[PDB]
Amino acid sequence: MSPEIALNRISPMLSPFISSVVRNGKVGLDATNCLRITDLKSGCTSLTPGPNCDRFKLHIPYAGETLKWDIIFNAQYPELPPDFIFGEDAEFLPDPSALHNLASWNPSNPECLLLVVKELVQQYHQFQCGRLRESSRLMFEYQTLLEEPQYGENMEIYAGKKNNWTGEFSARFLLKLPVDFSNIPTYLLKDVNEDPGEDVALLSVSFEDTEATQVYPKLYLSPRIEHALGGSSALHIPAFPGGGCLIDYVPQVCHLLTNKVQYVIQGYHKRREYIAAFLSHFGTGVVEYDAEGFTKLTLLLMWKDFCFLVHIDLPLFFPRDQPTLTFQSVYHFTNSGQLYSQAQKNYPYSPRWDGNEMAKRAKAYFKTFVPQFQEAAFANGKL
Amino acid sequence: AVQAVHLESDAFLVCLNHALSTEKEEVMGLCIGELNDDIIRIVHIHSVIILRRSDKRKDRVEISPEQLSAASTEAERLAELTGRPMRVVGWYHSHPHITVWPSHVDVRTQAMYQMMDQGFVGLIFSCFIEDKNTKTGRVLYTCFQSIQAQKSSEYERIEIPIHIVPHITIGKVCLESAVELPKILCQEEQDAYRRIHSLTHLDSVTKIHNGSVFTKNLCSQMSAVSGPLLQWLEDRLEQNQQHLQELQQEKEELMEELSSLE
Amino acid sequence: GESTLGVLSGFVLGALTFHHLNTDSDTEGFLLGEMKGEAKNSITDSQMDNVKVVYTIDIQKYIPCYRLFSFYNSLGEVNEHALKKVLSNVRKTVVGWYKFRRHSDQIMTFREQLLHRNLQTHLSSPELVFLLLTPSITTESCSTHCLEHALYKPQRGLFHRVPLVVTNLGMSDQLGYKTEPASCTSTVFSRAVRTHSSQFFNEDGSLKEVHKINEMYAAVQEELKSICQKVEQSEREVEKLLMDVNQLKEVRRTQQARATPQENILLCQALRTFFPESEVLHSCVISLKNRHISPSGCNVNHHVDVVDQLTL
Ligand SMILES: [Zn+2]
């Protein structure tokens, strides 16, 4: 059952907990982001009417994998704490001393279940390490990264059951990278009701051997970041060199991703300064503009009772390349039926200018060039 | 045709205790209740009558119109005693070590009973299912009716939604029905012995052997049925005394809470 | 190599199922009985085995716990009153405990494992059992229901399933009754059987053992009738008292129930914090006629979050 269908079936006294959990999306860092509620049952006499369901199964994405945990409430006793089942992972030993939000269970906070489940995943991480330690060799990396809190404490880990043949272990580390993605721009989705989620960059590293050989790195990006940096298929990553050196590999990807993000957000902020200055100056006659990326603007002006339009197109390399102006007549179209227009790209400009100076020089260029364009449009164009 | 079935847990308990009584044969009984309309045609089952099967054998389950006469007499008696509008509305049998689904013979019998009235419904209880692979036990129940096929005869099954109505406490009717099981078992053994004695010209040591068999059979009946049933009733009386004390404590607590508050 | 069979009576399972079906939620309780150690009296086998032992657990009665968490907290800690409470439920010997979870997988939960271990500790019975029942409905049509039950016991810290059997009349009643006369042309055999027939074959036909057993059965049947009357009266008293308690609970909850802008705050706070002094007058209101601004007082005091750069 999709979440938009499930949130209508849950007992009302319990709906807020699951609502907060779903709306928060993910629990830890997840990577796959495939959070869902699947099996949902009444857990009460079949003749109890209206919204009633309180048992369910939760798919928690964790370290590129998915944990299938059953969670149980009782509708007729909503105040009471939940109960948990960890699917086929019987060996899981959760220390009840670390579950502060479960020890001090309080329906008074709708986030309680989330705070519980979140803490439970923190124990599950540690539990994986307990199994992981029994494989040896790889702790040399875990320990090395644990001594770096900014990476170690923003981390998740998984280790696969022993191979029936050879007895090898598969393992995966997942890291949240500490870069300032806060100024990454937005972009509108088809559904709109969709949420891109927290703008974050996750580094997944997988090992097939019980040693530091044949290692597969992968970089997952929040949809906002992927859209800002021009798509995952348009970015390369340093391949894993060999041996054991995550502490020297992660800083390289962090430095490079920060470089690219700074370049693109600098371009974005300069385009925003341009559009902001041009709005401040000529907003009285704004027609349209790209409020999401600041790559386009379209203004309507009047010269001696004759209307005309100007389209400003800003290139990716805006601070360096000149923005293209396009003057258009509102009365004349050309012989081909297309709109009569003339583009200006070679004109007074300096990349060192700010928004205000560019607006001043643009108004000057308008006053100086509009008569030429209008004479040409009367000479060549047809009504 | 019926559209839903509500069964009083009061009677579901009698049915279940009848089903778990024996694994060596299939057992059967009839279901008394009423037809109702609400929100849809529904059958409310209030009580059941336990019946003795004579022919036995696998899959050969039928109720005699004699048993129907006895059941309709009991239905009228209960309707006058309780003031309820009770008619014989259904039947049930047990499928031990067998899937809960009806056999083609079960469905043909359900159709033969629907010929009386299309409002008749059937129940089936699947008892002890053994599975050392899973090492778990299971017990199921289902309700059904029958429909004439598109082709000649060959009736087909159809499912009926069934729910259990939480009857928080035991009705006396269900106790008076549950205590009939030992009586019926004893009467079955006694009838077997009486039919054995019909050929009076028989060996004396053989009669001693048959008497010993009768005594051993009733000893087994008392050790496995009457004894555990009586233990259950004593345990229930103790449970009810403790529950009465707890509920009296809770009543006094709520009386104090409402007197002191507002 | 040890086995631990679990044993029930049809009626006990029926009573547990009934107590559950009456409860419009999960429920739980304790299982009382006796544990007997027997040495597996090998069948076939040889003098080169390690002869298994069966710890047969006989469940005789159950005590239902009328509310959840009556004897434990969120972390499965039992607390001391729980001991007193299970003693107040005057008892003989505990052997296990049961729980009904409507629609759930047959695998004991986090709380159940911790609680079973804590109960084994506090009751000093490291051979307790856990009876988990999951009732469920199949086919969505609610035409067919399935009650799946299993026993659990700790072994290697992990809990493993244990077999369960329900005692019934079918267990080797083995009706015989030999027909066809074993007639012998023996004068001596006939003379002896006939001489010693009177000794218990009775007079005017019949047999004394038949009547002894019939009288015993009739006595037990009248005992059942009397206990049925007394249980019916106890049930009537329970019904009345329960309706009273439920009415008072309804009154309690009712008495307790009856006894008890859309402006851009973030934008205004960000605008005031980004232009302290200077012009300040910048607000979100303007004159509809001429392009002159109207002032707004805002909240000016709300707690701001995510205060971030205007241009890099
Ligand atoms: Zn059948």
PDB file of N, CA, C and O and ligand atoms in Angstrom, chain B residues 26 59 93 95 103 106 124, ligand 1:
ATOM      1  N   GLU B  26     -14.236 -37.694  11.859  1.00  0.00           N
ATOM      2  CA  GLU B  26     -14.807 -36.351  11.644  1.00  0.00           C
ATOM      3  C   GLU B  26     -16.099 -36.236  12.440  1.00  0.00           C
ATOM      4  O   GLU B  26     -16.908 -37.172  12.429  1.00  0.00           O
ATOM      5  N   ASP B  59     -15.161 -38.609   4.811  1.00  0.00           N
ATOM      6  CA  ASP B  59     -15.776 -37.715   3.796  1.00  0.00           C
ATOM      7  C   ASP B  59     -17.282 -37.968   3.695  1.00  0.00           C
ATOM      8  O   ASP B  59     -17.958 -37.160   3.041  1.00  0.00           O
ATOM      9  N   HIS B  93     -18.732 -29.262  10.412  1.00  0.00           N
ATOM     10  CA  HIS B  93     -17.998 -30.522  10.635  1.00  0.00           C
ATOM     11  C   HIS B  93     -16.501 -30.244  10.702  1.00  0.00           C
ATOM     12  O   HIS B  93     -16.084 -29.130  10.415  1.00  0.00           O
ATOM     13  N   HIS B  95     -12.403 -31.313   9.858  1.00  0.00           N
ATOM     14  CA  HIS B  95     -11.430 -31.897   8.910  1.00  0.00           C
ATOM     15  C   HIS B  95     -10.098 -32.039   9.626  1.00  0.00           C
ATOM     16  O   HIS B  95      -9.205 -31.228   9.434  1.00  0.00           O
ATOM     17  N   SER B 103     -14.631 -30.715   0.354  1.00  0.00           N
ATOM     18  CA  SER B 103     -14.573 -31.684  -0.766  1.00  0.00           C
ATOM     19  C   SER B 103     -15.815 -31.503  -1.644  1.00  0.00           C
ATOM     20  O   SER B 103     -16.799 -30.874  -1.200  1.00  0.00           O
ATOM     21  N   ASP B 106     -18.675 -32.621   0.238  1.00  0.00           N
ATOM     22  CA  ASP B 106     -19.123 -31.586   1.203  1.00  0.00           C
ATOM     23  C   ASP B 106     -20.005 -30.580   0.450  1.00  0.00           C
ATOM     24  O   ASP B 106     -21.070 -30.206   0.964  1.00  0.00           O
ATOM     25  N   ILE B 124     -16.695 -25.274   8.285  1.00  0.00           N
ATOM     26  CA  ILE B 124     -15.673 -26.347   8.361  1.00  0.00           C
ATOM     27  C   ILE B 124     -14.556 -25.878   9.283  1.00  0.00           C
ATOM     28  O   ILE B 124     -14.119 -24.722   9.166  1.00  0.00           O
TER      29      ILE B 124
HETATM   30 ZN    ZN D   1     -16.117 -32.328   4.855  1.00  0.00          ZN
END
